[PDB]
Design a protein around this ligand. Sequence first.
Ligand SMILES: CC(C)(C)C(=O)N[C@@H](C(=O)NO)c1ccc(-c2cc(F)c(F)c(F)c2)cc1
Ligand SMILES: [Mg+2]
Ligand SMILES: [Zn+2]
Length: 889
Amino acid sequence: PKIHYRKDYKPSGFIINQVTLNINIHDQETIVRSVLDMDISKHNVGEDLVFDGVGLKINEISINNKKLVEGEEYTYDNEFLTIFSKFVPKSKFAFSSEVIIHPETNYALTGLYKSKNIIVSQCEATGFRRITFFIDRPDMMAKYDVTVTADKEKYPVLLSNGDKVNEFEIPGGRHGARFNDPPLKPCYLFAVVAGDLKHLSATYITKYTKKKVELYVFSEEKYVSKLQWALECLKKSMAFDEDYFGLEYDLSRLNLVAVSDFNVGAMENKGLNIFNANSLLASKKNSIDFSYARILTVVGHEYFHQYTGNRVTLRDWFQLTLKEGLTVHRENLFSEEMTKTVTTRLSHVDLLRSVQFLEDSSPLSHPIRPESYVSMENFYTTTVYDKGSEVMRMYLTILGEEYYKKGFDIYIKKNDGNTATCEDFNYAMEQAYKMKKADNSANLNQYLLWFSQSGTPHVSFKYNYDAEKKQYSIHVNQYTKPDENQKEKKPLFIPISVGLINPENGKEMISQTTLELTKESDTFVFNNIAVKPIPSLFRGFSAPVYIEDQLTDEERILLLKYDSDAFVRYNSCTNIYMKQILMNYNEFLKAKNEKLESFQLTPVNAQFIDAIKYLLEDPHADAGFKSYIVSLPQDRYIINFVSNLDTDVLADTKEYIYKQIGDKLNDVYYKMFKSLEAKADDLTYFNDESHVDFDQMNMRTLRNTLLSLLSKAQYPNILNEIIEHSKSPYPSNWLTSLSVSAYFDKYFELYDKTYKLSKDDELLLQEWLKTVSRSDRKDIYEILKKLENEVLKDSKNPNDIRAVYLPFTNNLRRFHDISGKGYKLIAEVITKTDKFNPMVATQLCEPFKLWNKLDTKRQELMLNEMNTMLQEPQISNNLKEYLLRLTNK
Ligand SMILES: CC(C)(C)C(=O)N[C@@H](C(=O)NO)c1ccc(-c2cc(F)c(F)c(F)c2)cc1
Ligand SMILES: [Mg+2]
Ligand SMILES: [Zn+2]
């Protein structure tokens, strides 16, 4: 198994200047003819000409129109085509080939494949070589001239990159289209689509040069009514890159296409963005609320790639975070501007500190720019993407908006049309840094450690206040735990956005201030501080770190009530919860270990419960923020703080804490649940797909969160509310009615009701599956078996498989059943899936990522299932590599 090392990058000895493709689609085969106009580079040392080509059936290959003979002049081993140097020309030459591929049986959804009745490609990262021979790496930039032919009745819509320059009829009911794309691109941005597509379209006029851009959004005919929000999001995206970054679109046309079968969310193929249907299609009748932010972010994300990925592209795959981290950052700026709700930023922090922190403390831990890889399909991680985004966002925190924009524009102007590396970006940011600090001596060399060093830093604090001197000190320390990537961790450049709150009146005591911590520790002193403050630390979550604020719960409560920063308020609440959770966990653990007949639990802080009531009852407070404060921290966030975590003991801890708070606040919950109804469920704009109200959706989030808390608690007659809720027109509401009914004898009645509502929309049925999957049911194993037999069957649709199984894996009490049966079940599904889609099989491994964090029995149970998977004769390269790394082999 070949391991690629970042330090080993060398340019190719060859050049590919022009690609000319003919893709002839038939029912039982697709014939691909390719002419590559090639040259010898300055790096050439007379080596063999080696192409990537995977699973290709050779009809013929030729050099300069002379047929090549297998054995004597070339060998093919189903992975590499080797042409021995003596037969390779020494100047400009043409290589051509004709191969047969089979998209119809291509269930791995990489290269060219059939999704329902759409033919579609996915070439990132190294899928182009599954379509035809190539030197399949992003620094091999070429021009593309692509002709697609197909049966006209089945595939009336033909798309590829660039301009459609010809359309023509073909004998036998076929029909062709030629696309010429003169600008250079890497092959992973190639795409082709064929199908009976229906569309919505609009014309966009760019801000500055007033270019007319045609916008098309496509789906299968059945779901053409679900395309409108995507189109609006695209317009929004274009406007944002114009307004914030001063960047306009450069092509005449942009196509977005939804397909039912897709490994991930979407792909940024130049002029032809291809989407998982669940990340493009929605309507208010047939989608839950979450779809609207999802489509906004994914449409935005692929649009922002047009600059950060497509126009400035990657030298090599080790630079992945340079396009992914930066594009997620651009997408997050966009989404925060469009939603105007503080929960948007909170939700990204929530995701980072739960999923990515777990990854960063697991045996899979890697820096955002790794030093090596075996499987590229395993490289697309929350670390590379979301920690990557936070590292890109820190530049903005450090520079401030004006100098950030200057630096970003330096980066684009300098590297537009070329490949780039993480260093090129840091260099651009550094120029701005020099300007901001006003001396050419300032530099960001230390900042590069954010790209190379793995692990989450820990930042802790001590405070001192001299009342007579009016002098306040914040002493700060940073620490990263050694891991397999660095024995010795170095101090990072950590920007700490801070405020100082006067606890007597809640006012700000200093102006906007960002502490630049560049050492292992430092002491920051503030003069003319009139009274002892409460520090508001890492406002906006200003660095991706473990914050150890060393504040009392009294101080945290004061911040939660009166601080100006949504993240610090939410974090203060989070920290109060975590202290409570750790304390009760240990009390429950000791009672278990010592087999106590009786014991005491520390109650939840009453002043904390009082503050929650206060915020909940404040008519001016944010609905989304409210739903965060009544929710305990995610299980995967909690596990970062506990060794040998016993999941049962944690389930008992959560239970006690929720019951403590509900025993005091349920009447408040109920009252709010009722009074929120009118605005939350307002139907005024239900038939206007262009009208999306994120505040109103947050109000429904709060109601559905409250209803969940009231149902678990068996609040008097809450079942009445549940039943009425099931009649709501909003799927967020009537699907919530299914999951909260788990605690009642009406569960299977709502099961059937909601199934009948969901079954005729592919995506809605997937949301139904998720709802069932995450239901808090004692008979959840029997229910999963029912889904398998009645609904899922032998679907190879990744959306179906992920919907049935992943939410169940977050069932703390049941997935982690001490028999190991949940581990057994998921491993069976992974092995089954790995036979046809190794990438999705590896995604289904996610629950095992925390295996060495659990109590020793469950470690052993998980490890056994992983070793059983590893011993499957037919295990994919993807899955083997992943489990080998995960189990420290
Ligand atoms: C949901 C997110 C936004 C994280 C997503 O869909 N990411 C894709 C992306 O960044 N789009 O711009 C994405 C796209 C392709 C791949 C990808 C990588 C491979 F190696 C494959 F084989 C493949 F099929 C897809 C992974 C993630
Ligand atoms: Mg289907
Ligand atoms: Zn991306």
